[PDB]
Structures are given as structure tokens and as C-alpha cells.
Design a protein around this ligand. Structure first.
Ligand SMILES: Nc1ncnc2c1ncn2[C@@H]1O[C@H](COP(=O)(O)OP(=O)(O)OP(=O)(O)O)[C@@H](O)[C@H]1O
Ligand SMILES: Nc1ncnc2c1ncn2[C@@H]1O[C@H](COP(=O)(O)OP(=O)(O)O)[C@@H](O)[C@H]1O
Ligand SMILES: Nc1ncnc2c1ncn2[C@@H]1O[C@H](COP(=O)(O)OP(=O)(O)O)[C@@H](O)[C@H]1O
Ligand code: BEF
Ligand SMILES: [Mg+2]
Ligand SMILES: [Mg+2]
Ligand SMILES: [Mg+2]
Lengths: 172, 400, 151, 387, 370
């Protein structure tokens, strides 16, 4: 059994397509509601689980918090695909550029388009894009504090070697 | 019948263990490998086997492993491996001795037929017993061969280099309707250790180095998302291993999260395969619950571990706690519906001194019994009925 | 246990070869007389060298039935002896003049001669088999496959 | 669709559904529920996976689903999943408003009473059916035959069960379960194929080996003959292509698999198989009626469809009266008339019989348990439904 | 000394005459292994009997060679006698004469093949084949009575008066501790517990022995069990798993009073006893109401002796004084009775000796025995 999100037990959380707009700790501009600064929000969960969840090859999705965790678990693999050989001062800028560049949302090019509900309206697509850009900017910034933990000029190999690993053999 | 000590051969996917019944260890334990070439024809005489065939990779021979997933699957190589075992290492005469051979529970009838015709027509041995290997491994558990030390009811978990299977046996009978088998063991966890060294791009990732990192450095943790987190908090857990290359020079390997994530293949086999999804503690509960009701207290009370790939540090305790968690959760569901208490069930997973080769010690201990010559296919039965005499499963229920 | 006890043999009586082929009308001693008068004509035709007129007369009647092995074997002995005494260059002149009924009596008995090599020379029967099938066509073997089993 | 009673054979392997007087099921589909999963397998924009996927929608798409079965052995294991079959059955197969409708349900002859209670409670309190009736599945299969005597044996996906009947009286002391049927033969087919090295242990692969069993298996008429063809000859070997495109060779597993209905010990059950179970049931009936049972054994249910099963069963009862009543004396065997009824429709005989019975009692409003009677007596309202 | 061997239709009881209880007592079972796969040479054998069959039962198929008091399987019944003599009593049988037991109205060919195989194999000096109910009368210490035996396989009434037995008044019914166990295996399905193996039948027997009781009035206990969980009890399987059981505790024994619960056409044991005493002559009927002796393990349930009285007093006329004699040792009363009989000074002339079997063959037993 792979590790599912803690937030699938949460209820009446806001939703877009069928992503969960889970509480977030961040500085980036966007629609995600502030988390408690003392608590693990979905990005501390997604970074904590990623290195275990990308070895499994069979993952049942319980609800919209797992659909969110999967998008995070896939975007960590894109970031570790980018980061090889960078200085932290370059990696911040390269992975923010990766986070902000134009991407396909579910319902548009998207790999898991079989499992994610398309946006409910022309307006739901914008609240989805402005969430997923805020999410993946924070996810990149948070990840970099782990991969450049002990030394600031060389990505720690214990994080970089998952760049070949690929959650359930899917990628963005 | 001849009186000579029956010869015992546990041909594993990893190691062949060879010897004579009634000795206190195998005469040989060496890899199930054959080195072959890749005006008279002699390329079928030039081969080598075992520890003397690892020395031959640099002399331009191709090593191949004729047993894969616990089954013989090259019959040319296995016949040459047996002739060389019998006439070089065991140095015996087949016409004088009964042989105990071993195979997994779910082997095809075709492999017992091929084993029988090779033994009776090529070597001409006096008689043959083809034992289901985990049924023997129970008999290594006893404190002695004597009748008062026996405990003929217990689940036996066997895990070698090529197959793991769980056999329930009760009152000396193998409960064949309940055998579970999974072709994921000591080699599949080596290919996973090898796969990790290779993704980190370490200086050496040859099979012999992943094989050594398993048994030097790896262990079974309680839970991998806490163990990944511990490897951040506790940086002395990244061991450094010194490996010497095929061409005779030093290297150094950092060993990482494969120290726990590799043995986790047994307790989460989704890491290794899309096909075998059930983890070993739940695979054991499926054995004991499929088994008839009155033996279940006895089958949980004595879960014997066997075969080299069960030796990982903390393997017995992980299996005991995860199986005890499955079992007391199911009993507590039943206390809930009744409102009454229960006496529960004790689950003991038995690691023991002969665990590394338990199938051989089981075969040795059984073959000493005066009745053994009557359980063999004698070559007189072979000359009457041919190699089809070995085709019937002893273990499973057969129609007809 | 019960699984092996056959019941079909005692509750559903199967057909017999005499239901599929009509039973012979001539009695055993009536055919044993009819053959024993012909074999001396065939033995005589060898002794006077006209062995081909031996076959033409021997082949004018055929014994059949599960009651007559002790004279079907004597008829086969005379037939194989007559086939062993016809010159190989005369065979194509005999076979092209046989009726399709006589041909289907020749090839039927050469497949009885080929069934017992420890008493009959196969080499001359295989030679007759090549020549009778090459001249008269493959259907002459199909009429043997389909023929009565007590021939 | 129709104003008459709805009828529902919620079987262990297939739901079949329609109305009174239907000559064949209006719909049938696997009794399966699935949840979305990703699995190191193909993904496609050709289909959209909703949070709960069921029946035909799941079975057509099951590479993408964690398939689960709400029933085993003829009992509902998980009512949250059976609710997701019943929602689908009424709201998007039949397309019905159940408010005040009358429905006929079925269950096997020896179920836990808590199963019938919670199944009727659900009909009155999720859907609000105005009337419910529950019939023993094998007595329905006797209305399909237009018949009133002769022992009826039903073998489904979940359970094989037998109900002797004589002159319209149902012999409740002789009704019996053999807990071996079409699913135990399927778990056994997986276990036979595992000896060849083919693994089918994903939840979605179970429907593939059901389709394989249903396509290729047959009941051996003479075991030493099929063991001859099996061991001496290639003639049994057959190639099956999975929905993956993989081809797998299957041989002795064609006869050796459905043999577990005749020999339950192959699947670890100590019970006697079909021939010995039907014999020990007929031979337990009173002396005056045994003739009228052997003269009309009625087969029913999908697991009675294996090629050769009618002929093997008839032989194996002639063969067994011969051992156990004649002691091997051939003199009387021709006097033993046994007849198996094995009609073309028989997979659906429980539904076709239910659709006949639901016409016989459509207008007799006191014959059903009414919602108004359920809501005053609770579970005790079901005591209307016989002994 | 003489041996006394009760041929229990489910529970064999063996011992020496004058001893006050069976020296050994064990299930009348022969069990065979249901698995062919074996640890070779490791002490297995092709038949386990009595307590070897019970303690090993999970891997065995168990079959009793007695059904309804008739031996159905002779090649296996002699294994049980071999066990009674050589493994339980630990004697040579050829040194000691054997008193055997039989039900009334049994096939005479059963008693013939029993007396045949007992001399022709075990070579006992002498033997006898007494009826179980007249044996039970000796253990009760009286000369008048209407013994109601109720074993594993049979139940029967033998009206008996000053030693004159009434063979026209005997009743026998094939309803007993086996059929009550079949019906418990059937009705427990309603809880969702499925028992089907001949091993699990022994679990359902142990439930029936520990938890079942006779309702004093059935449709009042049925109403009480529906009204509250006050009547429910729990049992722990040989698996640590827990069973809960309720009105099934008394619906099982009620079958003995209502055979129509198992579809069988018969009077219950109250009506069968009444119709047996009402078949005796009116001078005797005055006394046998005061002497309903009970015997055999199916007469052992809690509440049976009181409910047996409340039923039989509704059939008997109110002027009579009506009593059930149910000893605390009643399970063994036929064996204690045989132990008394085989010890009598006056009995020793009426054994069948080996000498007079040779003069007549087994059909002598029909004149030497009742
Ligand atoms: N031709 C066939 N050959 C083999 N098996 C068949 C065949 N046709 C149907 N089956 C099997 O029958 C089962 C489905 O039959 P059916 O619908 O009668 O079962 P069910 O009613 O759902 O089960 P149950 O009555 O136990 O609840 C499946 O196992 C299916 O594979
Ligand atoms: N201490 C150990 N810890 C983990 N694995 C071990 C240990 N010692 C040996 N092994 C492994 O045991 C396997 C060999 O076990 P064996 O019983 O001989 O298997 P097989 O019979 O299939 O050849 C190899 O994978 C080997 O690396
Ligand atoms: N305490 C008890 N309460 C209820 N039933 C009992 C009790 N003890 C034993 N039994 C019943 O006793 C039966 C055996 O009775 P027994 O007289 O020894 O029969 P038999 O002599 O014919 O072998 C068993 O079938 C069992 O059902
Ligand atoms: F082949 Be080893 F026994 F796994
Ligand atoms: Mg091994
Ligand atoms: Mg059905
Ligand atoms: Mg008794």
C-alpha cells in the first residue's frame, strides 16, 4: 500500500474541477486559503511522501485531496528533472520559471485526463489555473529548501536521484 | 534397497546446497551457476560450476543460472550442473545411492518429468525423492530428530534467492489447498539494490556488489516514510561501503535509503512487480485463514522462517507485529459483535540457528528415517512406467 | 470409488459392425468349400506359368467374416503367392483391364499382406501398391479405408 | 417500460433485472463496483472515470478500476457498495422512480436472516418501494420450466443449492447448500494457471479469468479419457488472448477447473460435489417420491452451463445408484430412469421464473410485504415470507 | 473379571465388570487424512481412532461406523474394537469374556455379524449381546420402569415390570444427538456461521453440549428471546474467534419434542413415551408413570427432566402420580448396568461360550439373548 493524503479525511474543503483547494502556507499570490504556520499543509505532506510514493506502482485515489497530492507528486518529479547541477541561486529562478510557464490543466495535453474532472465552467478554469500556479510555485520553493538543505551550491544526491523515478510511470 | 547415505541436493535459484543425509552441515554451498563457452566436439566438456565458475568470467566463459524463480528452466545446463555435482564435488556413484532433490510447490509436472528422466536415464541413480522444499524446512526447526522434540504443526515461510512460498503443515500433513507462492525474493531485492546504486550513478553497481550490500547493510524497518525521515535526522545511517572492481582496484559506494527500502520488497511487493500485490504478512494470514478451522491456533503459534532471504535484520519481528496486527484486529471485530472477551491467539515467528539452509537440514533429517527408501521412486518403477511416474503432484489435490 | 464404474456399456447398448455392414448370407462351411475349390486353380496357374490367369480366377470370389480366419489366411497365402509370381512388366497390362470392383479386391488384400511381414514378402506388395494406385487413382485406397472390417 | 412489478435477481456474479412477464432479463451486468486507480498501465482520454463506476460501466473499463464485489457466497458483504449497484440498477439502467413500486427479490435457501432484513430495509428506506417479496432462488427456476415436481439444482457465481419439490410442496428439510460455484472454479482457475506461471492477482484480472473459464472450460465426461488426452496428446491445448493482447496457453486446466463442482476437495472444501450432493438429497426424500425426483432433475444458473455437465451429471448418478443401491449388480440398472432437464435458457431460469411469479401475484396486494407494514412491525413484517 | 463394552452409536464406553464407571470412553470415530501431501517417514498412519481422531481432526475426514444404532461399516468398526481392547483397556481380549450392547428392534444381521466377528477375530472366551434399556434398569436399582434411552444415534422406550419386559410395547425412534447436531449446524446458518466439514460438526456438538437447554415452555422462551438479549450466550471457537448464540440454544433440543422441525413424521419423546405406556396393560400402567428412568447422553440437557414431566403429565390422567428418574450419572447408565449384570453370580451360566458358537454358528445369539 502506497501513502495517501491525510486531507482525504477533511470535508467541506473548496474544490475546482475535482482538485481540492487545500489550505496552504505561502508568500505567492493566488486563491489558496492561509494554513496554520505551525501545521503540515498539503505541500509539507506532498514533499514528505514523494520519496516513498514514487516507488509504488498501484495507487487507488480516495477523493479530491489525493487528486491534489498526485499533481504535487508529479510536479516534484519535474522539479528534480530540472534541478541537476544548479547552484541554489539559479535553481530558485529556474524552478520558479518552470512553475510559472504555460501548462495544461485537467480537461485540456494533460496526462491523467481520464481521472481528473474538467473545469465546471469557463470561470472554473481560471480559479483552477490561479490555484495550480500558486501551488506549484510554493511546491518548487519548498522542495528547494530540502534538496539544498546541507550545502547551497550542489543539489543533495539523496534528493536528485529520484529525477529518473516517475510516479506510477506517469509524468506532466 | 541400498543402505548407503541418501544424497541430498537443494538446488536453489541462488545457491545449490549438496551433501549426504545425517551430516551436520552441507558438504557444499555454492551458486547455481554454470560457466560455458560463448577437431572433435568438446564445448560440452569445457564447462565449470559453483565457486569455481565465478573465476571464469574473465577467462571468456559466459555464466548462466539454470534455475530461475525456483524452477529449472534450462535442461541442458541443469543436466551438466548435476553431472559435475555428482562426479566432481560429491564424487559419488549414482547406482549405489538414493537421491533427495527439492523443488518449489507450484513447479510444473514437466519439470518433475525432466528431473526424473535425467536422474534415471542419464545418471542411472538407485532411486529419487523430489521433495517440496518448504515441507522439509519445518524439520530444521526441531531441537533434535527424536520423536519427543518434534512439533508437526506450523506455518513455514520459505524465501530464497528466487521464490518465496508459505506452506501450512498440520499434524505432519501439508495443507495443499492453502499454499501461497510469490516469485519475488533474494534476487529481485538485489536487482532493486542494484537499480538504486545505478540511479545514483555510484562507481560500481555489478550484481556481486548489490548481493553484498543486501547482507552487509540492509534491514527491515517499521515503516518507510518514517525511515526516510530518520535518514534526514540521523546522518550516520548513510553507510560507506568499500567495493573492489572486477578488474582489481578499489572504489567507495555510499549506501542510502536502500538500507531499508530494499527489504521492504517483501512487506510491499508493489515496489517490485505489478502482478504480486499482496504483502507477506497478509499473504500469511490468507494461508492460515484458508486452512481448516481447528489447526489455526497451531499454525499461528509456530510460523517457521526459512531460506537465506528471511535473514534480514528485524525481518522476524516485522512479520510477527504486522501479522499480530492483522490477527488481533480480526479477533477484536468478533469480540465487538459478541460483547464477550476472547483468549486471543499467540503468534510466534520462529527464527532459529539453521534458518540459512533449513530445506537441506530438513531433507537430511527426513532421509535418515528407515522408511525413506519406500517413499522414493525406485529405478525398478522407472523401468516399468517411465518418467511419467514423477508427473503427479504429491502436495495438491489431484482429480483421478 | 464410484467414478470409475462404467454404466454406458449396460444402459446404452452401442452399434455393432453387423448393423453398419450387412451380415454375410453364405454359411461358414459354404464359403470354406467355395474357397477350397479356388485355391487349387490358383496353385495350378503358378505351376503352368500363367500366374496372371491365376490372379484373374482367384480374385473372382473373396472370403469375409469373423467366423473364417482359418480360410481368409489361406486365401491371403494364395493371393500373396500369386502376386509374388507375376512379372513386374505385366502388372500395368493386368491393372488397366481390371474392373473397379476387382481393383478394390486387390488393394484390400495387399493391405492384409502388408499387415503380416513375418509371413509375407512386403517388397512385392509395395510394388503392386505403387502400380495399382498410379494406374487407377487415389480413390482405390479410400474404398479400402471405408471397406468392411471383416475383410 | 412497464406498470407491473419490477423483478431483480441480484446474483453474486450478475445482476439481472426487468419486469413481470419478461421472457428474458431486460438488462444484466456484472455485480461489480469500482473506484479509480492508476497502475503502471495504459491511460486514455477515450473515457472519463467517475468516483464510483459500476456494472457495465466498470467491466468495460476495468483496466482503470479497483474492481470489488458487493457479494460472496450469495450474501452482501458490503452494503455501501451494494447501494451503488442498486442506485445504478434503478436510476440509470431501468431509469425508474421507485416511490411506491412493487419489486420481487431473490436469495439462496440458507442465508443469514440479517441479509434479508437489511436488503428489505434498504428497499423500503433508500428507494421507498411500496411492496417487496423475496423468493428462494431455486423455487423460481421451477416456475420457468412450467413445472411442479422434480429436484431443482441451481449453480450460480456464488453458491450451488438444491431444492426438492413434489406436487407443488417444497421440502424445506432437504434444501441444501454446496458452498462451491462459478467463483470457486474461477479462484481455482487462477490457481491452476499460477502453476504455469501466469499471474492474475490484480482485482481487475478476475473478470478476465471469468471470461476465460466461460469461453474455454468443459466438464470431462470420463476422467481417465481426458487425463489420456491431457497427458498423451496435444489436442486439448487452446490459445486465449487477454484484453492486454497477451496470449496464454491453456490445456488440462480446461477440464480440471470445472471438475471442482464434482470434486470440491480440489478447492479445499470437504463437501460432496454435484452428483453425490444431488444423490444424497434425493435419497433422503421419502420412499414414495424418489422416482418423481430422479425422473426430473432440473439444472439452473450460469455455473450449470459447462459443456458436458448435463451428460456427466446423468452418468454420475446412474454410476452412483449402481454403487450405493444395487451394490454393483448390473441386472437392475436399465430400470433406473434418471432424466436431467438442461434447457437452453437455464442460466436465466431464476430471473425468467421470477418474472413468471411476479405476474402470478402482481394484483394480490396482501401477498407482498408493504412499506406501510414494514414501517410498523420492522423486521417482523418479513415473517409473511414462509418458514 | 469380564469386559463390558458399550457399542456407543457416537461414544464408545469400555471397562471391567464391577468397576463403577467406564475405564475408557472415547468417540466411535474412524478418521482418515484428507490430504495426500506428507512429511515422509514422520509418524503418519492411514486411520486415526477415538481421541487420535478428535485431537487431529482439522486434517481428517471423520466417519462414525455406527449410524442409527446399526453398524454400516464393518472393516472400520473392528478398528474401534481393536482400539478398545489393545490401546484403551490394554488387555488381550482372549483372556476375558465380553458383554456387548445393542438397541431394541435392530437388524438381526447386525447382532449376527457382531457375534461372528467377536469370536472369529478377537477369540473371546464367551460373550453376550444385551439390550441397552434393560441394562440401564440395573444401574437405576429397580425391577419396574419405562426406561427412555437417548443416545447419539437412537432413542427408545422399554416398558418393563418385575423383570418381565413388554416387547410389543417397545418404541424406537431414529432421532438423537446426531440429528440434534445436524439441526444445530442447519439453524446456526441464520446467524451467518457456516459449518460444513466433519471436523466442524464436532465444534457444533461441543456448542450443543455446553450451551443448549430444553425450554420448559417453547413458545414462551421464543417470545422471551425476541424480547431481550438476556437469553444470548457466547462460545470461543478453536480459532480464538467468538460465536454468539440465542434462541438456537433451545430450538435445537426442541427437535426431540417436535420431530417436524427436521421434517420427520413422528411423535416427540413425550407422546412416544405416553403411547408406549398406553400400549401396556392397565394394571401395569399405574406404576410405570412413577418410574420413567432416563438414559444416554441426549437425556442430559438442562431443563429436560422438568419439561419431560410437564408434557407427560398433560397426557397422563390427573389421578396418577408421575415421576422422572434422571440420575446425575445417566450418561453411562447402560455401561454401569452392564458392569452390574456381568458381575452377578446368577448370570455366569448364560454367556454364549466359544464352545457353543462352534456347534451352531452366529445364529445361536437369537436364542441365548433377548
Ligand atoms: N457457459 C458458461 N460456462 C461456464 N461458466 C458459465 C457459463 N455461463 C455462465 N457461467 C458462470 O456463471 C456465473 C454467473 O451465473 P449466475 O448469473 O447464475 O450467477 P449468480 O446468479 O449471479 O450467482 P448466485 O446465484 O450464486 O448469486 C459466472 O461464474 C459465470 O462465469
Ligand atoms: N544475512 C542475509 N541477509 C539477507 N539476505 C541474505 C543473507 N544471507 C544470505 N542472504 C541471501 O539469501 C539468498 C540465498 O538463500 P537460499 O536459501 O540459498 O536461496 P536459494 O535456495 O533460492 O538459492 C541470497 O539472496 C542471499 O544474498
Ligand atoms: N451434557 C450433555 N448435554 C447435552 N448433550 C450431551 C451431553 N453430554 C453428551 N451429550 C450428548 O451425548 C450423546 C452421546 O450419548 P451416548 O449415550 O453416549 O450415545 P451412545 O451410547 O449411543 O454412543 C452425544 O451425541 C451428545 O449429543
Ligand atoms: F530458489 Be531459491 F529457493 F529461492
Ligand atoms: Mg531455496
Ligand atoms: Mg443465481
Ligand atoms: Mg448409546
Amino acid at each position: 500500500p502506497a501513502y495517501h493524503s491525510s486531507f482525504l479525511s477533511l470535508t467541506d474543503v473548496p474544490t475546482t474541477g475535482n482538485i481540492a483547494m487545500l489550505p496552504l502556507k505561502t508568500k505567492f499570490r493566488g486563491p489558496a486559503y492561509p494554513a496554520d504556520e505551525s501545521q503540515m499543509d498539503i505541500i509539507d505532506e506532498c514533499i514528505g511522501l514523494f520519496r516513498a510514493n514514487c516507488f509504488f506502482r498501484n495507487f487507488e485515489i480516495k477523493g479530491p485531496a489525493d487528486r491534489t497530492l498526485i499533481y504535487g507528486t508529479l510536479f516534484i518529479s519535474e522539479c528534480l528533472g530540472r534541478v541537476n547541477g544548479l547552484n541554489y541561486r539559479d535553481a530558485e529562478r529556474q524552478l520558479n520559471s518552470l512553475a510559472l510557464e504555460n501548462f495544461s490543466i485537467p480537461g485540456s495535453g494533460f496526462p491523467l485526463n481520464a481521472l481528473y474532472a474538467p473545469p465546471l465552467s469557463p470561470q472554473d478554469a481560471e480559479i483552477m489555473r490561479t490555484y495550480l500556479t500558486q501551488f506549484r510555485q510554493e511546491l518548487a520553493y519548498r522542495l528547494l529548501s530540502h534538496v539544498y538543505a546541507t550545502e547551497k551550491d550542489h543539489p543533495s544526491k539523496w534528493w536528485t536521484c529520484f529525477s529518473k523515478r516517475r510516479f506510477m510511470n506517469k509524468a506532466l | 534397497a541400498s543402505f548407503n547415505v541418501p544424497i541430498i541436493m537443494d538446488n536453489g535459484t541462488g545457491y545449490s546446497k549438496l551433501g549426504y543425509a545425517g551430516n551436520d552441515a552441507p558438504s557444499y554451498v555454492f551458486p547455481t551457476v554454470i560457466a560455458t563457452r560463448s577437431k572433435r566436439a568438446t564445448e560440452d566438456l569445457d564447462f565449470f560450476i559453483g565457486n569455481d565458475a565465478l573465476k571464469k568470467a574473465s577467462a571468456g566463459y559466459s555464466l548462466d543460472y539454470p534455475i530461475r524463480h525456483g524452477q529449472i528452466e534450462n535442461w541442458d545446463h541443469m543436466e551438466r550442473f548435476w553431472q559435475q555435482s555428482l562426479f566432481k564435488y560429491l564424487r559419488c556413484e549414482p547406482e549405489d545411492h538414493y537421491f533427495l532433490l527439492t523443488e518449489p510447490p507450484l513447479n510444473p509436472p514437466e519439470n518433475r518429468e525432466n528431473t526424473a528422466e535425467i536422474m534415471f536415464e542419464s545418471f542411472n541413480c538407485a532411486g529419487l525423492y523430489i521433495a517440496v522444499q518448504a515441507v522439509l524446512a519445518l524439520a530444521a526447526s526441531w531441537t533434535s530428530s527424536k520423536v519427543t522434540d518434534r512439533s508437526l504443526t506450523g506455518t513455514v515461510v520459505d524465501s530464497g534467492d528466487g521464490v518465496t512460498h508459505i506452506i501450512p503443515v498440520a499434524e505432519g500433513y501439508v495443507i495443499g489447498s492453502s499454499i501461497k507462492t510469490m516469485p519475488l525474493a533474494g534476487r529481485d531485492v538485489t536487482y532493486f539494490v542494484q537499480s538504486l546504486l545505478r540511479d545514483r550513478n555510484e562507481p560500481d553497481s555489478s550484481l556481486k556488489t548489490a548481493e553484498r550490500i543486501k547482507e552487509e547493510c540492509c534491514y527491515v524497518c517499521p515503516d518507510i516514510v518514517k525511515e526516510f525521515s530518520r535518514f534526514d535526522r540521523e546522518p550516520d545511517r548513510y553507510l560507506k561501503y568499500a567495493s573492489e572492481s572486477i578488474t582489481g582496484h578499489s572504489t567507495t559506494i555510499d549506501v542510502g535509503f536502500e538500507r531499508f527500502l530494499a527489504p521492504e520488497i517483501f512487506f510491499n511487493p508493489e515496489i517490485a512487480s505489478s502482478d504480486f500485490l499482496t504483502p507477506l504478512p497478509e499473504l500469511v494470514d490468507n494461508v492460515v485463514q484458508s486452512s481448516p478451522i481447528d489447526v489455526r491456533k497451531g499454525l499461528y503459534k509456530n510460523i517457521v522462517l526459512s531460506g537465506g532471504s528471511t535473514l534480514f535484520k528485524n525481518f522476524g519481528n516485522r512479520l510477527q507485529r504486522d501479522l499480530k496486527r492483522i490477527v488481533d484486529e480480526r479477533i477484536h471485530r468478533s469480540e465487538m459483535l459478541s460483547g464477550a472477551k476472547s483468549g486471543g491467539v499467540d503468534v510466534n515467528v520462529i527464527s532459529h540457528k539453521r534458518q540459512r539452509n533449513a530445506v537441506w537440514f530438513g531433507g537430511s533429517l527426513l532421509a535418515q528415517t528407515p522408511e525413506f527408501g519406500s517413499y522414493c521412486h525406485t529405478k525398478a518403477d522407472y523401468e516399468e512406467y517411465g518418467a511419467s511416474i514423477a508427473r503427479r503432484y504429491q502436495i495438491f489435490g489431484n482429480s483421478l | 470409488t464410484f467414478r470409475t464404474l462404467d454404466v454406458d456399456s449396460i444402459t446404452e447398448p452401442v452399434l455393432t459392425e453387423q448393423d453398419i455392414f450387412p451380415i454375410r448370407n453364405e454359411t461358414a462351411e459354404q464359403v470354406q468349400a467355395a474357397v477350397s475349390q479356388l485355391i487349387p486353380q490358383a496353385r495350378s496357374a503358378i505351376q503352368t506359368g500363367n500366374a496372371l490367369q491365376g490372379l484373374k480366377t482367384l480374385l473372382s470370389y473373396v472370403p469375409y467374416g469373423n467366423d473364417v480366419q482359418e480360410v481368409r489366411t489361406q486365401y491371403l497365402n494364395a493371393f500373396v503367392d500369386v502376386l509374388s509370381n507375376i512379372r513386374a512388366a505385366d502388372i500395368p497390362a493386368f491393372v488397366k483391364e481390371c474392373s473397379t470392383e476387382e481393383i478394390d479386391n486387390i488393394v484390400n488384400f495387399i493391405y492384409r499382406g502388408l499387415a503380416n511381414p513375418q509371413a509375407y514378402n512386403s517388397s512385392v506388395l509395395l510394388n503392386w501398391h505403387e502400380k495399382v494406385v498410379e494406374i487407377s487413382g487415389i480413390g482405390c485406397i479410400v474404398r479400402v479405408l471405408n471397406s468392411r472390417p471383416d475383410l | 417500460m412497464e406498470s407491473a412489478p419490477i423483478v431483480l435477481d441480484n446474483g453474486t456474479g450478475f445482476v439481472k433485472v426487468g419486469y413481470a412477464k419478461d421472457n428474458f432479463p431486460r438488462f444484466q451486468f456484472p455485480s461489480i463496483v469500482g473506484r479509480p486507480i492508476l497502475r503502471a498501465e495504459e491511460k486514455t482520454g477515450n473515457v472519463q472515470i467517475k468516483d464510483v463506476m459500476v456494472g457495465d460501466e466498470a467491466e468495460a473499463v476495468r483496466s482503470l478500476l479497483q474492481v470489488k464485489y458487493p457479494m460472496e457466497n450469495g450474501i452482501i458483504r458490503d452494503f455501501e457498495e451494494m447501494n451503488q449497484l442498486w442506485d445504478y440498477t434503478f436510476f440509470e439502467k431501468l431509469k425508474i422512480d421507485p416511490r411506491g413500486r412493487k419489486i420481487l427479490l431473490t436469495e439462496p435457501p440458507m442465508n443469514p436472516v440479517a441479509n434479508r432484513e437489511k436488503m428489505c430495509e434498504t428497499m423500503f428506506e433508500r428507494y421507498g418501494f411500496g411492496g417487496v417479496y423475496v423468493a428462494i432462488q431455486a423455487v423460481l427456476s421451477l416456475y420457468a420450466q412450467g413445472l411442479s415436481s422434480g429436484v431443482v439444482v441451481d449453480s450460480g457465481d456464488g453458491v450451488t443449492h438444491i431444492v426438492p419439490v413434489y406436487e407443488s410442496v417444497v421440502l424445506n428439510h432437504l434444501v441444501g447448500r454446496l458452498d462451491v460455484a462459478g467463483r470457486d472454479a474461477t479462484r481455482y482457475l487462477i490457481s491452476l494457471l499460477l502453476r504455469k506461471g501466469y499471474a492474475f492477482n490484480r482485482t481487475a484480472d478476475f473478470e478476465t479469468v471469468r471470461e476465460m473459464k466461460e469461453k474455454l472450460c468443459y466438464v470431462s465426461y470420463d476422467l481417465e479419457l481426458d487425463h489420456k488426452l491431457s497427458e498423451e496428446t496435444t489436442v486439448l491445448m487452446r490459445n486465449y488472448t487477454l484484453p492486454d493482447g497477451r496470449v496464454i496457453k491453456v490445456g488440462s486446466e480446461r477440464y480440471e477447473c470445472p471438475e471442482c463442482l464434482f470434486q470440491p476437495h480440489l478447492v479445499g472444501s470437504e463437501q460432496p460435489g454435484l452428483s453425490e450432493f444431488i444423490f444424497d438429497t434425493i435419497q433422503a426424500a421419502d420412499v414414495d417420491i424418489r422416482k418423481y425426483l430422479y425422473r426430473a432433475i432440473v439444472l439452473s444458473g450460469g455455473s450449470s452451463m459447462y459443456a458436458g455437465l448435463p451428460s456427466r451429471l446423468e452418468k454420475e448418478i446412474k454410476q452412483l445408484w449402481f454403487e450405493r443401491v444395487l451394490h454393483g449388480d448390473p441386472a437392475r440398472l436399465p430400470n433406473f430412469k434418471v432424466k436431467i432437464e438442461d434447457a437452453p435458457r437455464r442460466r436465466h431460469a431464476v430471473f425468467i421464473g421470477g418474472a413468471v411469479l411476479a405476474d402470478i401475484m402482481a394484483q394480490n396486494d396482501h401477498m407482498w410485504v408493504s412499506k406501510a407494514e414494514w414501517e410498523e412491525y420492522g423486521v417482523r413484517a418479513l415473517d409473511k415470507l414462509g418458514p | 473379571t469380564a469386559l463390558v463394552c458399550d457399542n456407543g452409536s457416537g461414544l464408545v464406553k469400555a471397562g471391567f465388570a464391577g468397576d463403577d464407571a467406564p475405564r475408557a470412553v472415547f468417540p466411535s470415530i474412524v478418521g482418515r487424512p484428507r490430504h495426500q501431501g506428507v512429511m515422509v517417514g514422520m509418524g503418519q498412519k492411514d486411520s486415526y481412532v477415538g481421541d487420535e481422531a478428535q485431537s487431529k481432526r482439522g486434517i481428517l475426514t471423520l466417519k462414525y461406523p455406527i449410524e442409527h444404532g446399526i453398524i454400516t461399516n464393518w472393516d472400520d468398526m473392528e478398528k474401534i474394537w481393536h482400539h478398545t481392547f489393545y490401546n484403551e483397556l490394554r488387555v488381550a481380549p482372549e483372556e476375558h469374556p465380553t458383554l456387548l450392547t445393542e438397541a431394541p428392534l435392530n437388524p438381526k444381521a447386525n447382532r449376527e455379524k457382531m457375534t461372528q466377528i467377536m469370536f472369529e477375530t478377537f477369540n473371546v472366551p464367551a460373550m453376550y449381546v444385551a439390550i441397552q434399556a434393560v441394562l440401564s434398569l440395573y444401574a437405576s436399582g429397580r425391577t419396574t420402569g419405562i426406561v427412555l434411552d437417548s443416545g447419539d444415534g437412537v432413542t427408545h422406550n422399554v416398558p418393563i415390570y418385575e423383570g418381565y419386559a413388554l416387547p410389543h410395547a417397545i418404541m424406537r425412534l431414529d432421532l438423537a444427538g446426531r440429528d440434534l447436531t445436524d439441526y444445530l449446524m442447519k439453524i446456526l446458518t441464520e446467524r451467518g456461521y457456516s459449518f460444513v466439514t466433519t471436523a466442524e460438526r464436532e465444534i457444533v456438538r461441543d456448542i450443543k453440549e455446553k450451551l443448549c437447554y430444553v425450554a420448559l415452555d417453547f413458545e414462551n422462551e421464543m417470545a422471551t428471546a425476541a424480547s431481550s438479549s438476556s437469553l444470548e450466550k457466547s462460545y470461543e471457537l478453536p480459532d480464538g474467534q467468538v460465536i454468539t448464540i440465542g434462541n438456537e440454544r433451545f430450538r435445537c433440543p426442541e427437535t426431540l419434542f417436535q420431530p417436524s422441525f427436521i421434517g420427520m413424521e413422528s411423535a416427540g419423546i413425550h407422546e412416544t413415551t405416553y403411547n408406549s405406556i398406553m400400549k401396556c396393560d392397565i394394571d401395569i400402567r399405574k406404576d410405570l408413570y412413577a418410574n420413567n428412568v432416563m438414559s444416554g447422553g441426549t437425556t442430559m440437557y438442562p431443563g429436560i427432566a422438568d419439561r419431560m414431566q410437564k408434557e407427560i403429565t398433560a397426557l397422563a390422567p390427573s389421578t396418577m402420580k408421575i415421576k422422572i428418574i434422571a440420575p446425575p450419572e445417566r450418561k453411562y447408565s447402560v455401561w454401569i448396568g452392564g458392569s452390574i449384570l456381568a458381575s452377578l453370580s446368577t448370570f455366569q451360566q448364560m454367556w454364549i461360550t466359544k464352545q457353543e458358537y462352534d456347534e451352531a454358528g452366529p445364529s445361536i445369539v437369537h436364542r441365548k439373548c433377548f
